[PDB]
């Protein structure tokens, strides 16, 4: 307690800064929609004088406690932050973004402060529990914390008298004045008022705003695979589908419909049965567009949806190949490099003995999910091979044919030219499919 009393004295204002964070989160529930340069303009941008003074005193206290605690955050908090935050004494005329509890850029001030406060409170209560109580179940979230639940005291008004009453004077017959601090009475006095009966705080109800736009589609695939026992598409089924979507605008409409239905299914439930027809028509109730796509989806259930999506995506891209149409128009040009004669020769050597149908599909999925253009060399720099990244991406969730792409795939695929391999494979498949009959 005397080790961390200095910072324990400032946990009384944690509800205030937390309420400020809730208000700022609710009032700015967006991304990249901020225009206020300084906090002064933001606070003066309110006609309500009472609300203005509320924000004034709240932000003054927030600034004071942040300045008082901006030393242990770089060394003791469980979140790592750069030193540029605590190097300067922030003022009222400082930048505005700092008061926003983000988690990645310049927003770690409030998050780090509240996390340090809750961490020290939790550590203190945990130590107290493991000292004497040895058991507890009382705990509350940060969504309804009050001034009654936090630990608050004033040294001059409450802490000094309680300890000064526990200074014992002893005198001997010979004449002396010895000072003794009986540990038991002071321990019971301090414990029974401040650090007993307090809840065990958890980090669940933290005021935090969403910074990442959840559009990587990978969490949707994981949610689909975890919620349902997804199954692969039967060969006759996929053959019929490819038969009934030979057009292009048909493929685009199918893409739109399946993307909407996948967006619904990833953030909700779905029975592995209950074929895609009845799911389309009456589960979410959209109107009929074209009988062709419905007749295509008729022979599929929910347990194939993602697989269907991937195949459908490939089909669209594959169509763009036949009509000599620029097939991506979105990806980086650094990957749009032509393979060399030896490269395509080894690629054809692989293609001569390969299950092209699944391989082209998965490789197209890899490009369309990760090779989006900018910000793509972080883990897929155009200097690796394909067998390593393919096996790494497929060992996660795939148990399909693997040995062909690690015992027969080219060892120098030149990832820099990654579209060329799939394009040449698709041309080979199209020639095989069309020129025979």
């Amino acid at each position: 307690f005397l080790q961390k009393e200095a910072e324990l004295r400032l946990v009384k204002f944690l509800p205030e800064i937390l309420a400020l964070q809730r208000d700022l989160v609710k009032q700015f529930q967006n991304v990249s929609r901020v225009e206020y340069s300084s906090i002064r303009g933001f606070i003066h941008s309110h006609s309500s004088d009472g609300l203005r003074k509320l924000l004034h005193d709240r932000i003054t206290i927030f600034l004071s406690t942040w300045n008082a605690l901006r030393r242990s955050l770089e060394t003791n908090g469980e979140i790592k932050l750069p030193k540029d935050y605590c190097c300067s004494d922030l003022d009222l005329d400082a930048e505005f973004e700092v008061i926003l509890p983000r988690r990645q850029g310049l927003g770690l001030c409030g998050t780090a402060l509240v996390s340090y406060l809750i961490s020290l409170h939790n550590n203190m209560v945990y130590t107290v529990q493991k000292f004497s109580n040895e058991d507890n179940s009382y705990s509350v979230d940060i969504s309804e914390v009050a001034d009654l639940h936090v630990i608050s005291y004033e040294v001059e008004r409450d802490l000094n008298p309680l300890i000064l009453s526990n200074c014992q004077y002893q005198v001997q017959q010979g004449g002396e004045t010895s000072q003794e601090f009986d540990l038991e009475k002071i321990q019971r006095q301090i414990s029974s008022r401040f650090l007993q009966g307090k809840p065990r705080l958890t980090l669940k109800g933290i005021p935090t705003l969403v910074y990442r736009r959840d559009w990587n589609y990978e969490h949707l695939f994981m949610d689909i695979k975890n919620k349902m026992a997804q199954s692969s598409l039967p060969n006759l089924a996929i053959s019929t589908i490819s038969g009934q979507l030979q057009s292009y605008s048909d493929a685009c409409e199918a893409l739109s419909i399946i993307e909407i239905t996948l967006g619904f299914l990833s953030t909700a439930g779905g029975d592995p049965g209950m074929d895609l027809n009845v799911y389309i028509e009456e589960v979410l109730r959209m109107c009929d567009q074209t009988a062709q796509v419905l007749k295509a989806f008729s022979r599929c259930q929910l347990r194939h949806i993602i697989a269907l999506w991937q195949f459908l995506s490939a089909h669209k891209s594959e169509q763009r190949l036949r009509l000599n149409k620029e097939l991506f128009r979105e990806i980086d040009v650094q990957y749009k490099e032509e393979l060399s004669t030896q490269h395509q020769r080894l690629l054809g050597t692989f293609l001569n003995e390969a299950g092209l149908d699944a391989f082209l599909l998965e490789l197209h999925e890899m490009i369309v999910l990760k090779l989006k253009g900018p910000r793509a060399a972080n883990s897929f720099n155009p200097n690796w091979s394909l067998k390593d990244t393919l096996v790494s991406y497929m060992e996660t969730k795939d148990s399909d044919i693997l040995s062909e792409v690690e015992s027969q795939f080219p060892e120098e695929i030149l990832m820099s030219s990654c579209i060329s391999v799939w394009k040449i494979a698709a041309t080979r498949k199209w020639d095989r499919q069309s020129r025979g009959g």
């Binding site: 080790q3 910072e7 004071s64 300045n67 008082a68 901006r70 030393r71 770089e74 030193k83």
Partner: protein
């Protein structure tokens, strides 16, 4: 990590500079005071080398370390239930007691403080000597 002398301006209302991961508060305080006065002694010859050593400031080691020492001394006089003269007496006793510690048991540590292990060993021996000499001031 974060080597050097990274510290804010002493005129700050922040934390009281509580002890680090593994040191008693009194020993840690005495050790940091001795390190600060050692940096003053070194800077009194070549302030440019210290300017390179300490990261934030570029103007004057002397004034900033003087404010540091003033804060240190006032927190020491707030530390011992003595008089400021008696705090000075205690620090003088501590300083003069480590001169008569000719007993050599300070092996297996580097004399340059270039590694964290040797730095921690130096801190360990410094803690040992500081406690040995602070358990001898009440009766002196």
């Amino acid at each position: 990590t974060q080597t050097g002398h990274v510290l804010g301006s002493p005129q700050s209302s922040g934390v009281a500079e509580v002890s680090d991961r593994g040191q008693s508060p009194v020993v840690f305080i005495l050790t940091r005071l001795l390190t600060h006065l050692a940096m003053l002694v070194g800077a009194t010859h070549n302030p440019q080398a210290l300017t390179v050593i300490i990261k934030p400031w570029v103007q004057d080691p002397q004034g900033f370390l003087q404010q540091h020492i003033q804060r240190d001394l006032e927190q020491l006089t707030k530390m011992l239930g003595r008089s400021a003269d008696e705090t000075i007496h205690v620090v003088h006793l501590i300083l003069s007691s480590l001169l008569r510690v000719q007993s050599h048991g300070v092996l297996n540590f580097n004399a340059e403080l270039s590694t964290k292990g040797c730095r921690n060993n130096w801190e360990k021996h410094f803690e040992t000597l500081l406690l040995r000499e602070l358990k001898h001031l009440d009766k002196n």
